[PDB]
Amino acid sequence: YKFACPECPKRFMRSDHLTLHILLHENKK
């Protein structure tokens, strides 16, 4: 576990890939 999401409890070894995940965070509810 290198990085961690500030909104969710996800963790990724990469920085770019991790951010790719947080792209869906834009949509809430």
Side-chain angles (χ1 to χ4, degrees):
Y1 296 134
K2 270 74 167 200
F3 263 76
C5 206
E7 217 281 278
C8 73
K10 304 191 211 188
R11 306 164 231 80
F12 309 57
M13 283 175 259
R14 290 161 79 149
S15 139
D16 221 276
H17 270 199
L18 192 153
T19 304
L20 196 72
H21 119 223
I22 321 142
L23 254 76
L24 32 71
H25 263 296
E26 66 180 82
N27 195 279
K28 60 256 270 276
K29 199 250 280 158

PDB file of all heavy atoms in Angstrom:
ATOM      1  N   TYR A   1       0.843  -1.228   0.000  1.00  0.00           N
ATOM      2  CA  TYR A   1       0.000   0.000   0.000  1.00  0.00           C
ATOM      3  C   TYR A   1       0.864   1.259   0.000  1.00  0.00           C
ATOM      4  O   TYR A   1       1.492   1.592   1.008  1.00  0.00           O
ATOM      5  CB  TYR A   1      -0.905  -0.017   1.240  1.00  0.00           C
ATOM      6  CG  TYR A   1      -1.908  -1.151   1.257  1.00  0.00           C
ATOM      7  CD1 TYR A   1      -2.096  -1.917   2.401  1.00  0.00           C
ATOM      8  CD2 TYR A   1      -2.669  -1.455   0.134  1.00  0.00           C
ATOM      9  CE1 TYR A   1      -3.012  -2.951   2.426  1.00  0.00           C
ATOM     10  CE2 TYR A   1      -3.586  -2.488   0.150  1.00  0.00           C
ATOM     11  CZ  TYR A   1      -3.754  -3.233   1.299  1.00  0.00           C
ATOM     12  OH  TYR A   1      -4.666  -4.262   1.319  1.00  0.00           O
ATOM     13  N   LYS A   2       0.891   1.953  -1.137  1.00  0.00           N
ATOM     14  CA  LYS A   2       1.680   3.176  -1.272  1.00  0.00           C
ATOM     15  C   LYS A   2       0.826   4.414  -1.004  1.00  0.00           C
ATOM     16  O   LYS A   2       1.169   5.240  -0.159  1.00  0.00           O
ATOM     17  CB  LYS A   2       2.297   3.261  -2.671  1.00  0.00           C
ATOM     18  CG  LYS A   2       3.675   2.622  -2.770  1.00  0.00           C
ATOM     19  CD  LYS A   2       3.590   1.103  -2.756  1.00  0.00           C
ATOM     20  CE  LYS A   2       4.905   0.467  -3.181  1.00  0.00           C
ATOM     21  NZ  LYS A   2       4.722  -0.942  -3.629  1.00  0.00           N
ATOM     22  N   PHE A   3      -0.284   4.537  -1.734  1.00  0.00           N
ATOM     23  CA  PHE A   3      -1.183   5.674  -1.585  1.00  0.00           C
ATOM     24  C   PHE A   3      -2.504   5.263  -0.936  1.00  0.00           C
ATOM     25  O   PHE A   3      -2.786   4.074  -0.766  1.00  0.00           O
ATOM     26  CB  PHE A   3      -1.459   6.300  -2.952  1.00  0.00           C
ATOM     27  CG  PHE A   3      -0.597   7.489  -3.266  1.00  0.00           C
ATOM     28  CD1 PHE A   3       0.727   7.321  -3.639  1.00  0.00           C
ATOM     29  CD2 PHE A   3      -1.111   8.773  -3.192  1.00  0.00           C
ATOM     30  CE1 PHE A   3       1.522   8.413  -3.934  1.00  0.00           C
ATOM     31  CE2 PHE A   3      -0.322   9.868  -3.484  1.00  0.00           C
ATOM     32  CZ  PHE A   3       0.996   9.688  -3.855  1.00  0.00           C
ATOM     33  N   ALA A   4      -3.313   6.264  -0.584  1.00  0.00           N
ATOM     34  CA  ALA A   4      -4.614   6.033   0.038  1.00  0.00           C
ATOM     35  C   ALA A   4      -5.590   7.151  -0.327  1.00  0.00           C
ATOM     36  O   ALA A   4      -5.225   8.328  -0.321  1.00  0.00           O
ATOM     37  CB  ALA A   4      -4.471   5.925   1.549  1.00  0.00           C
ATOM     38  N   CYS A   5      -6.829   6.777  -0.651  1.00  0.00           N
ATOM     39  CA  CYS A   5      -7.850   7.754  -1.024  1.00  0.00           C
ATOM     40  C   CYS A   5      -8.297   8.577   0.181  1.00  0.00           C
ATOM     41  O   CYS A   5      -8.537   8.035   1.261  1.00  0.00           O
ATOM     42  CB  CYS A   5      -9.062   7.054  -1.640  1.00  0.00           C
ATOM     43  SG  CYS A   5     -10.019   8.089  -2.772  1.00  0.00           S
ATOM     44  N   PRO A   6      -8.424   9.907   0.007  1.00  0.00           N
ATOM     45  CA  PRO A   6      -8.857  10.808   1.080  1.00  0.00           C
ATOM     46  C   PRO A   6     -10.360  10.705   1.361  1.00  0.00           C
ATOM     47  O   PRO A   6     -10.827  11.120   2.423  1.00  0.00           O
ATOM     48  CB  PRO A   6      -8.508  12.192   0.534  1.00  0.00           C
ATOM     49  CG  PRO A   6      -8.591  12.044  -0.947  1.00  0.00           C
ATOM     50  CD  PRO A   6      -8.163  10.633  -1.253  1.00  0.00           C
ATOM     51  N   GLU A   7     -11.112  10.152   0.403  1.00  0.00           N
ATOM     52  CA  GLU A   7     -12.558  10.001   0.545  1.00  0.00           C
ATOM     53  C   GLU A   7     -12.937   8.573   0.940  1.00  0.00           C
ATOM     54  O   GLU A   7     -13.717   8.371   1.871  1.00  0.00           O
ATOM     55  CB  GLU A   7     -13.260  10.382  -0.764  1.00  0.00           C
ATOM     56  CG  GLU A   7     -14.577  11.113  -0.560  1.00  0.00           C
ATOM     57  CD  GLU A   7     -15.716  10.177  -0.199  1.00  0.00           C
ATOM     58  OE1 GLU A   7     -16.295   9.564  -1.121  1.00  0.00           O
ATOM     59  OE2 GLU A   7     -16.028  10.058   1.004  1.00  0.00           O
ATOM     60  N   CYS A   8     -12.388   7.587   0.225  1.00  0.00           N
ATOM     61  CA  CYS A   8     -12.682   6.182   0.502  1.00  0.00           C
ATOM     62  C   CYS A   8     -11.475   5.466   1.112  1.00  0.00           C
ATOM     63  O   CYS A   8     -10.381   6.027   1.192  1.00  0.00           O
ATOM     64  CB  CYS A   8     -13.127   5.477  -0.780  1.00  0.00           C
ATOM     65  SG  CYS A   8     -11.791   5.168  -1.954  1.00  0.00           S
ATOM     66  N   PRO A   9     -11.671   4.216   1.569  1.00  0.00           N
ATOM     67  CA  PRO A   9     -10.619   3.417   2.194  1.00  0.00           C
ATOM     68  C   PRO A   9      -9.806   2.563   1.208  1.00  0.00           C
ATOM     69  O   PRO A   9      -9.230   1.546   1.603  1.00  0.00           O
ATOM     70  CB  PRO A   9     -11.421   2.529   3.144  1.00  0.00           C
ATOM     71  CG  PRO A   9     -12.734   2.315   2.459  1.00  0.00           C
ATOM     72  CD  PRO A   9     -12.952   3.491   1.534  1.00  0.00           C
ATOM     73  N   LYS A  10      -9.739   2.974  -0.063  1.00  0.00           N
ATOM     74  CA  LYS A  10      -8.973   2.224  -1.059  1.00  0.00           C
ATOM     75  C   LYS A  10      -7.490   2.574  -0.971  1.00  0.00           C
ATOM     76  O   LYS A  10      -7.119   3.687  -0.593  1.00  0.00           O
ATOM     77  CB  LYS A  10      -9.480   2.485  -2.484  1.00  0.00           C
ATOM     78  CG  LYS A  10     -10.961   2.198  -2.678  1.00  0.00           C
ATOM     79  CD  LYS A  10     -11.344   2.223  -4.149  1.00  0.00           C
ATOM     80  CE  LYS A  10     -12.780   2.688  -4.345  1.00  0.00           C
ATOM     81  NZ  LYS A  10     -13.226   2.532  -5.759  1.00  0.00           N
ATOM     82  N   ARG A  11      -6.652   1.608  -1.328  1.00  0.00           N
ATOM     83  CA  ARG A  11      -5.204   1.777  -1.304  1.00  0.00           C
ATOM     84  C   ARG A  11      -4.584   1.174  -2.558  1.00  0.00           C
ATOM     85  O   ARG A  11      -4.978   0.090  -2.993  1.00  0.00           O
ATOM     86  CB  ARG A  11      -4.610   1.117  -0.063  1.00  0.00           C
ATOM     87  CG  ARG A  11      -5.243   1.574   1.244  1.00  0.00           C
ATOM     88  CD  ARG A  11      -4.912   0.626   2.387  1.00  0.00           C
ATOM     89  NE  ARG A  11      -6.106   0.212   3.123  1.00  0.00           N
ATOM     90  CZ  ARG A  11      -6.946  -0.745   2.715  1.00  0.00           C
ATOM     91  NH1 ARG A  11      -6.732  -1.394   1.572  1.00  0.00           N
ATOM     92  NH2 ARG A  11      -8.004  -1.056   3.455  1.00  0.00           N
ATOM     93  N   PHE A  12      -3.635   1.892  -3.152  1.00  0.00           N
ATOM     94  CA  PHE A  12      -2.986   1.433  -4.378  1.00  0.00           C
ATOM     95  C   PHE A  12      -1.475   1.634  -4.317  1.00  0.00           C
ATOM     96  O   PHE A  12      -0.990   2.595  -3.718  1.00  0.00           O
ATOM     97  CB  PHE A  12      -3.553   2.178  -5.591  1.00  0.00           C
ATOM     98  CG  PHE A  12      -5.061   2.175  -5.690  1.00  0.00           C
ATOM     99  CD1 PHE A  12      -5.840   2.671  -4.656  1.00  0.00           C
ATOM    100  CD2 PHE A  12      -5.698   1.693  -6.823  1.00  0.00           C
ATOM    101  CE1 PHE A  12      -7.210   2.690  -4.744  1.00  0.00           C
ATOM    102  CE2 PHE A  12      -7.079   1.708  -6.916  1.00  0.00           C
ATOM    103  CZ  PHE A  12      -7.834   2.209  -5.873  1.00  0.00           C
ATOM    104  N   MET A  13      -0.740   0.725  -4.954  1.00  0.00           N
ATOM    105  CA  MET A  13       0.720   0.802  -4.991  1.00  0.00           C
ATOM    106  C   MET A  13       1.187   1.910  -5.937  1.00  0.00           C
ATOM    107  O   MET A  13       2.258   2.486  -5.747  1.00  0.00           O
ATOM    108  CB  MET A  13       1.317  -0.542  -5.421  1.00  0.00           C
ATOM    109  CG  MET A  13       1.323  -1.586  -4.316  1.00  0.00           C
ATOM    110  SD  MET A  13       1.893  -3.199  -4.888  1.00  0.00           S
ATOM    111  CE  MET A  13       0.333  -4.056  -5.093  1.00  0.00           C
ATOM    112  N   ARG A  14       0.371   2.205  -6.956  1.00  0.00           N
ATOM    113  CA  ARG A  14       0.695   3.246  -7.928  1.00  0.00           C
ATOM    114  C   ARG A  14      -0.046   4.541  -7.606  1.00  0.00           C
ATOM    115  O   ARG A  14      -1.064   4.530  -6.910  1.00  0.00           O
ATOM    116  CB  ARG A  14       0.336   2.785  -9.342  1.00  0.00           C
ATOM    117  CG  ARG A  14       1.237   1.682  -9.874  1.00  0.00           C
ATOM    118  CD  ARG A  14       0.592   0.940 -11.035  1.00  0.00           C
ATOM    119  NE  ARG A  14       0.698   1.686 -12.291  1.00  0.00           N
ATOM    120  CZ  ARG A  14       0.796   1.117 -13.497  1.00  0.00           C
ATOM    121  NH1 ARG A  14       0.798  -0.209 -13.626  1.00  0.00           N
ATOM    122  NH2 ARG A  14       0.889   1.880 -14.580  1.00  0.00           N
ATOM    123  N   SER A  15       0.471   5.654  -8.120  1.00  0.00           N
ATOM    124  CA  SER A  15      -0.138   6.962  -7.895  1.00  0.00           C
ATOM    125  C   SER A  15      -1.118   7.312  -9.017  1.00  0.00           C
ATOM    126  O   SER A  15      -2.221   7.796  -8.757  1.00  0.00           O
ATOM    127  CB  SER A  15       0.940   8.035  -7.763  1.00  0.00           C
ATOM    128  OG  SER A  15       0.582   9.235  -8.428  1.00  0.00           O
ATOM    129  N   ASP A  16      -0.708   7.061 -10.264  1.00  0.00           N
ATOM    130  CA  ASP A  16      -1.549   7.348 -11.425  1.00  0.00           C
ATOM    131  C   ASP A  16      -2.766   6.428 -11.463  1.00  0.00           C
ATOM    132  O   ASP A  16      -3.895   6.893 -11.628  1.00  0.00           O
ATOM    133  CB  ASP A  16      -0.745   7.202 -12.721  1.00  0.00           C
ATOM    134  CG  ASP A  16      -1.070   8.288 -13.728  1.00  0.00           C
ATOM    135  OD1 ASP A  16      -2.066   8.133 -14.466  1.00  0.00           O
ATOM    136  OD2 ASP A  16      -0.329   9.290 -13.781  1.00  0.00           O
ATOM    137  N   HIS A  17      -2.530   5.123 -11.305  1.00  0.00           N
ATOM    138  CA  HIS A  17      -3.612   4.140 -11.314  1.00  0.00           C
ATOM    139  C   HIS A  17      -4.618   4.434 -10.206  1.00  0.00           C
ATOM    140  O   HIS A  17      -5.829   4.380 -10.428  1.00  0.00           O
ATOM    141  CB  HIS A  17      -3.058   2.725 -11.146  1.00  0.00           C
ATOM    142  CG  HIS A  17      -2.730   2.045 -12.436  1.00  0.00           C
ATOM    143  ND1 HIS A  17      -2.586   0.680 -12.545  1.00  0.00           N
ATOM    144  CD2 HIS A  17      -2.510   2.545 -13.675  1.00  0.00           C
ATOM    145  CE1 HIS A  17      -2.290   0.369 -13.791  1.00  0.00           C
ATOM    146  NE2 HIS A  17      -2.238   1.481 -14.500  1.00  0.00           N
ATOM    147  N   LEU A  18      -4.108   4.756  -9.017  1.00  0.00           N
ATOM    148  CA  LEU A  18      -4.961   5.075  -7.878  1.00  0.00           C
ATOM    149  C   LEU A  18      -5.867   6.252  -8.204  1.00  0.00           C
ATOM    150  O   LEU A  18      -7.071   6.207  -7.948  1.00  0.00           O
ATOM    151  CB  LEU A  18      -4.113   5.410  -6.657  1.00  0.00           C
ATOM    152  CG  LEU A  18      -4.875   5.477  -5.336  1.00  0.00           C
ATOM    153  CD1 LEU A  18      -3.952   5.150  -4.179  1.00  0.00           C
ATOM    154  CD2 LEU A  18      -5.505   6.843  -5.146  1.00  0.00           C
ATOM    155  N   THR A  19      -5.279   7.302  -8.776  1.00  0.00           N
ATOM    156  CA  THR A  19      -6.037   8.486  -9.143  1.00  0.00           C
ATOM    157  C   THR A  19      -7.094   8.137 -10.189  1.00  0.00           C
ATOM    158  O   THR A  19      -8.185   8.712 -10.191  1.00  0.00           O
ATOM    159  CB  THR A  19      -5.109   9.588  -9.669  1.00  0.00           C
ATOM    160  OG1 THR A  19      -4.109   9.904  -8.715  1.00  0.00           O
ATOM    161  CG2 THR A  19      -5.835  10.873 -10.014  1.00  0.00           C
ATOM    162  N   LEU A  20      -6.777   7.170 -11.062  1.00  0.00           N
ATOM    163  CA  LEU A  20      -7.717   6.726 -12.088  1.00  0.00           C
ATOM    164  C   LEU A  20      -9.010   6.243 -11.432  1.00  0.00           C
ATOM    165  O   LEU A  20     -10.101   6.430 -11.969  1.00  0.00           O
ATOM    166  CB  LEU A  20      -7.101   5.609 -12.938  1.00  0.00           C
ATOM    167  CG  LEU A  20      -7.814   5.331 -14.262  1.00  0.00           C
ATOM    168  CD1 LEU A  20      -7.563   6.457 -15.254  1.00  0.00           C
ATOM    169  CD2 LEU A  20      -7.361   3.997 -14.841  1.00  0.00           C
ATOM    170  N   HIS A  21      -8.867   5.637 -10.249  1.00  0.00           N
ATOM    171  CA  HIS A  21     -10.000   5.143  -9.483  1.00  0.00           C
ATOM    172  C   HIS A  21     -10.855   6.294  -8.986  1.00  0.00           C
ATOM    173  O   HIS A  21     -12.072   6.276  -9.108  1.00  0.00           O
ATOM    174  CB  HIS A  21      -9.495   4.311  -8.282  1.00  0.00           C
ATOM    175  CG  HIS A  21      -9.875   4.843  -6.922  1.00  0.00           C
ATOM    176  ND1 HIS A  21      -9.013   4.895  -5.851  1.00  0.00           N
ATOM    177  CD2 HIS A  21     -11.059   5.328  -6.461  1.00  0.00           C
ATOM    178  CE1 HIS A  21      -9.689   5.378  -4.802  1.00  0.00           C
ATOM    179  NE2 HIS A  21     -10.931   5.657  -5.122  1.00  0.00           N
ATOM    180  N   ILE A  22     -10.198   7.273  -8.386  1.00  0.00           N
ATOM    181  CA  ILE A  22     -10.885   8.425  -7.809  1.00  0.00           C
ATOM    182  C   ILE A  22     -11.630   9.263  -8.857  1.00  0.00           C
ATOM    183  O   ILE A  22     -12.345  10.203  -8.504  1.00  0.00           O
ATOM    184  CB  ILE A  22      -9.919   9.315  -6.988  1.00  0.00           C
ATOM    185  CG1 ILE A  22      -8.933   8.450  -6.193  1.00  0.00           C
ATOM    186  CG2 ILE A  22     -10.699  10.198  -6.025  1.00  0.00           C
ATOM    187  CD1 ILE A  22      -7.543   9.025  -6.121  1.00  0.00           C
ATOM    188  N   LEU A  23     -11.499   8.906 -10.139  1.00  0.00           N
ATOM    189  CA  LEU A  23     -12.206   9.618 -11.199  1.00  0.00           C
ATOM    190  C   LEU A  23     -13.717   9.402 -11.065  1.00  0.00           C
ATOM    191  O   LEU A  23     -14.504  10.296 -11.376  1.00  0.00           O
ATOM    192  CB  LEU A  23     -11.728   9.153 -12.579  1.00  0.00           C
ATOM    193  CG  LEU A  23     -10.821  10.138 -13.321  1.00  0.00           C
ATOM    194  CD1 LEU A  23      -9.415  10.116 -12.737  1.00  0.00           C
ATOM    195  CD2 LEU A  23     -10.789   9.815 -14.807  1.00  0.00           C
ATOM    196  N   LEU A  24     -14.116   8.210 -10.590  1.00  0.00           N
ATOM    197  CA  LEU A  24     -15.542   7.896 -10.412  1.00  0.00           C
ATOM    198  C   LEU A  24     -16.135   8.594  -9.180  1.00  0.00           C
ATOM    199  O   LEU A  24     -17.355   8.739  -9.080  1.00  0.00           O
ATOM    200  CB  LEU A  24     -15.798   6.384 -10.311  1.00  0.00           C
ATOM    201  CG  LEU A  24     -14.698   5.533  -9.679  1.00  0.00           C
ATOM    202  CD1 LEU A  24     -14.608   5.778  -8.175  1.00  0.00           C
ATOM    203  CD2 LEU A  24     -14.957   4.068  -9.970  1.00  0.00           C
ATOM    204  N   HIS A  25     -15.275   9.018  -8.245  1.00  0.00           N
ATOM    205  CA  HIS A  25     -15.732   9.693  -7.025  1.00  0.00           C
ATOM    206  C   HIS A  25     -16.549  10.950  -7.335  1.00  0.00           C
ATOM    207  O   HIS A  25     -17.407  11.342  -6.541  1.00  0.00           O
ATOM    208  CB  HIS A  25     -14.541  10.059  -6.136  1.00  0.00           C
ATOM    209  CG  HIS A  25     -14.273   9.063  -5.053  1.00  0.00           C
ATOM    210  ND1 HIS A  25     -15.149   8.785  -4.027  1.00  0.00           N
ATOM    211  CD2 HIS A  25     -13.194   8.265  -4.848  1.00  0.00           C
ATOM    212  CE1 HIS A  25     -14.588   7.850  -3.249  1.00  0.00           C
ATOM    213  NE2 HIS A  25     -13.403   7.502  -3.705  1.00  0.00           N
ATOM    214  N   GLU A  26     -16.281  11.580  -8.487  1.00  0.00           N
ATOM    215  CA  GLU A  26     -16.997  12.793  -8.890  1.00  0.00           C
ATOM    216  C   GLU A  26     -18.513  12.618  -8.752  1.00  0.00           C
ATOM    217  O   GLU A  26     -19.213  13.537  -8.324  1.00  0.00           O
ATOM    218  CB  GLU A  26     -16.638  13.179 -10.330  1.00  0.00           C
ATOM    219  CG  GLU A  26     -17.106  12.179 -11.377  1.00  0.00           C
ATOM    220  CD  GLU A  26     -16.724  12.588 -12.788  1.00  0.00           C
ATOM    221  OE1 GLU A  26     -15.571  12.325 -13.191  1.00  0.00           O
ATOM    222  OE2 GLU A  26     -17.575  13.175 -13.487  1.00  0.00           O
ATOM    223  N   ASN A  27     -19.011  11.431  -9.108  1.00  0.00           N
ATOM    224  CA  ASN A  27     -20.438  11.137  -9.011  1.00  0.00           C
ATOM    225  C   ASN A  27     -20.782  10.594  -7.626  1.00  0.00           C
ATOM    226  O   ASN A  27     -20.343   9.505  -7.249  1.00  0.00           O
ATOM    227  CB  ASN A  27     -20.853  10.129 -10.089  1.00  0.00           C
ATOM    228  CG  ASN A  27     -22.359  10.061 -10.266  1.00  0.00           C
ATOM    229  OD1 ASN A  27     -23.056   9.395  -9.498  1.00  0.00           O
ATOM    230  ND2 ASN A  27     -22.871  10.748 -11.280  1.00  0.00           N
ATOM    231  N   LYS A  28     -21.568  11.362  -6.872  1.00  0.00           N
ATOM    232  CA  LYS A  28     -21.975  10.963  -5.526  1.00  0.00           C
ATOM    233  C   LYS A  28     -23.447  10.553  -5.496  1.00  0.00           C
ATOM    234  O   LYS A  28     -24.236  10.988  -6.337  1.00  0.00           O
ATOM    235  CB  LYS A  28     -21.723  12.100  -4.530  1.00  0.00           C
ATOM    236  CG  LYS A  28     -22.480  13.382  -4.848  1.00  0.00           C
ATOM    237  CD  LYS A  28     -21.565  14.439  -5.450  1.00  0.00           C
ATOM    238  CE  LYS A  28     -20.946  15.322  -4.377  1.00  0.00           C
ATOM    239  NZ  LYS A  28     -21.857  16.430  -3.970  1.00  0.00           N
ATOM    240  N   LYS A  29     -23.801   9.712  -4.518  1.00  0.00           N
ATOM    241  CA  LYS A  29     -25.172   9.225  -4.354  1.00  0.00           C
ATOM    242  C   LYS A  29     -25.537   8.214  -5.445  1.00  0.00           C
ATOM    243  O   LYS A  29     -25.627   8.612  -6.626  1.00  0.00           O
ATOM    244  CB  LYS A  29     -26.171  10.390  -4.350  1.00  0.00           C
ATOM    245  CG  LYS A  29     -27.517  10.038  -3.734  1.00  0.00           C
ATOM    246  CD  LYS A  29     -28.619   9.991  -4.782  1.00  0.00           C
ATOM    247  CE  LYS A  29     -29.122  11.384  -5.130  1.00  0.00           C
ATOM    248  NZ  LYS A  29     -29.772  11.424  -6.470  1.00  0.00           N
TER     249      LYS A  29
END
